[PDB]
Amino acid sequence: KLLKLLKKVVGALG
């Protein structure tokens, strides 16, 4: 399932 945005958000949260 689409989680590509979630990976980018976790990448912004460090």
Cα distance between residue 3 and residue 11, in whole Å: 12
Cα distance between residue 2 and residue 14, in whole Å: 20
Residues preceding chain discontinuities in the chain with C to N over 2.5 Å:
none
Token pair, residue 7, equals: 């990976």
Alpha helices per DSSP H over the chain: 4-12
Cα distance between residue 1 and residue 3, in whole Å: 6
Q: Which of 5, 2, 1 is nearest to 13 (CA)?
A: 5
Torsion angle in degrees (nearest 10) through CA of 5, 11, 12, 14:
150
Taking CA atoms, 4 is separated from 1, 14, in Å, by 9, 15
Tokens 């460090």 belong to which residue? 14
Q: How was this structure determined?
A: NMR
Which bin fits 2, alpha (ψ -120 to 50), beta or left (φ > 0)?
A: beta
What SS3 state is found at 2? coil
